[PDB]
Amino acid sequence: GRLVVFPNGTRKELSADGQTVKVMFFNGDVKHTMPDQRVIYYYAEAQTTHITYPDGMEVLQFPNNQTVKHFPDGRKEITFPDQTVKTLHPDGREESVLTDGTIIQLNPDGSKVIQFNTGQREIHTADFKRREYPDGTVKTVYSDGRQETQYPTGRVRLKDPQGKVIMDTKA
């Protein structure tokens, strides 16, 4: 049950059972250090809880009920109250998994990819919006209005903006 009061008012007190080292900082921050070396830190101003594990993993819990987990591999995973999980990868990719299973990926090249739970995949770039279907069919609409269908057979059919076929090839 040791107690140290530092000249600045910060208190360090061991729990009655000897297991938790509790620091109450003069600014209202509180730190608990556990036997397994887990550190739990409450930031009073931000009202945020920050847990640091021995392996270096960190988890933050914010007032708005968001959680952010920092993984040793460099990923940062943000969980929203509604169950949406957003992962930030080291390469700059951001992938959100919605509660219905939909995946929305934001890529460092400007593109947005949506993977629907039906297998269908939508790719949006500055130059086109493309839909890929599980069988191998691809429909691409260009910013200029041209439309290309690739069939799983190798056939590629291209149409002008009015829908007139201007190219239809197959090997």
Residue numbers in the entry: 954 to 1124
Provide passages from the article that reported this PDB entry.
Of particular interest in this regard is the putative centriolar CPAP–STIL complex, as mutations in both components result in MCPH. CPAP and STIL are strictly required for centriole assembly: STIL at a very early stage and CPAP slightly later, possibly by controlling the organisation and length of the centriolar microtubules. Instead, we demonstrate that the TCP domain of CPAP constitutes a novel proline-rich-motif (PRM) recognition-domain that specifically binds to a short target motif in STIL. Our mutational analysis of the interface demonstrates a remarkable correlation between the ability of mutant proteins to bind to one another in vitro and their ability to support centriole assembly in vivo, providing compelling support for our structural model of the metazoan CPAP–STIL complex. These data strongly suggest that the interaction between CPAP and STIL is a conserved, essential step in centriole biogenesis.
Intriguingly, a MCPH mutation (E1235V) in the conserved C-terminal domain of CPAP (the so-called TCP-domain or G-Box) appeared to weaken this yeast-two-hybrid interaction. The involvement of CPAP E1021 in the interaction with STIL in zebrafish is potentially significant, as the equivalent residue in human CPAP (E1235) is mutated to valine in some MCPH patients. To test whether this mutation disrupts the organisation of the TCP domain, we obtained the crystal structure of D. rerio CPAP937–1124 carrying the E1021V mutation. The structure of the wild-type and the mutant TCP domain were virtually identical (RMSD = 0.1 Å over 142 Cα pairs) demonstrating that the TCP domain structure was not compromised. ITC experiments with WT D. rerio STIL404–448 showed that the mutation of residues F978, Y994, and F1015 decreased the binding strength by ∼20 to 40-fold, while mutation of E1021 decreased the binding strength by approximately eightfold. Taken together these results lend strong support to our structural model and indicate that the E1021V MCPH mutation leads to roughly an order of magnitude decrease in affinity of the CPAP–STIL interaction. The structures we report here reveal that E1235 is one of the several residues involved in the binding interface with STIL, making an important sidechain–mainchain contact. This structural model explains how the E1235V mutation can compromise complex formation, and we have confirmed that this is the case with zebrafish proteins in vitro.
